[PDB]
Design a protein around this ligand. Structure first.
Ligand SMILES: *[C@@H]1O[C@H](CO)[C@@H](O)[C@H](O)[C@H]1NC(C)=O
Ligand SMILES: *[C@@H]1O[C@H](CO)[C@@H](O)[C@H](O)[C@H]1NC(C)=O
Lengths: 50, 50, 50, 47
């Protein structure tokens, strides 16, 4: 439940949903917002595995 | 090939419609498709003998 | 100077771009776009009371 | 006398513990209902 609920976190991004980031922003900015989400999700998965 | 967590009917429909991401196909015949609780197993003949 | 301020978070949006609509496809895996909200999935009649 | 051929005590032990996952090909619970958790609904990549 914790691992799934973490998907709604923004981790500093404008939106937790990737489709909104890609829809609103051009790749040069969308990649920044996505990297913020990737970092947060990677940390959540690494914590889960540990 | 075991398609984990999916009903064999849905897999067969997706195969006939060419809707699957992997583009390889396991040759499907009668007695080569078996539904188990782990998923749909295609390419192995189920037998009664243990 | 003109500043165009807007919120992209509320669901009941009223100002959409000049994008053409398509018909509605249900019970199939479809890439949908509803007022800017996008995704891939199967649409079905809902029993939810909005 | 009952399916699964478990002892009376085993039947009690199984009824007293409540399982969350009870994994199966649970593709029938994905429509209508309340889309209850299970905890990714096989939608967010957790099975
Ligand atoms: C597969 O789907 C059929 C209906 O199309 C259903 O009767 C059957 O029980 C399902 N099997 C599993 C393992 O979900
Ligand atoms: C096993 O035997 C039963 C006998 O009723 C039969 O119905 C079933 O189809 C058999 N399965 C295989 C894989 O031979």
């Amino acid at each position: 439940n914790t691992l799934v609920k973490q998907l709604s976190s923004k981790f500093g991004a404008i939106s937790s949903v990737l489709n909104d980031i890609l829809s609103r922003l051009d790749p040069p900015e969308a990649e920044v917002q996505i990297d913020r989400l990737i970092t947060g999700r990677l940390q959540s998965l690494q914590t889960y595995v540990t | 090939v075991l398609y984990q967590g999916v009903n064999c009917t849905e897999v067969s429909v997706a195969i006939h419609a060419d809707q699957l991401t992997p583009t390889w196909r396991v040759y499907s015949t009668g007695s080569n498709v078996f539904q188990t609780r782990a998923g749909c197993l295609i390419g192995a003949e189920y037998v009664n003998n243990s | 100077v003109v500043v165009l301020s807007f919120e992209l978070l509320h669901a009941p949006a009223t100002v959409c771009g000049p994008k053409k609509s398509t018909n509605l496809v249900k019970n199939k895996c479809v890439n949908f776009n509803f007022n800017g909200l996008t995704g891939t999935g199967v649409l079905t009649k809902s029993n939810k009371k909005f | 006398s009952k399916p699964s051929k478990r002892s009376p005590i085993e039947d009690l032990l199984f009824n007293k513990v409540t399982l969350a996952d009870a994994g199966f090909i649970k593709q029938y619970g994905d429509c209508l209902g309340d889309i209850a958790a299970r905890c990714a609904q096989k939608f967010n990549g957790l099975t």
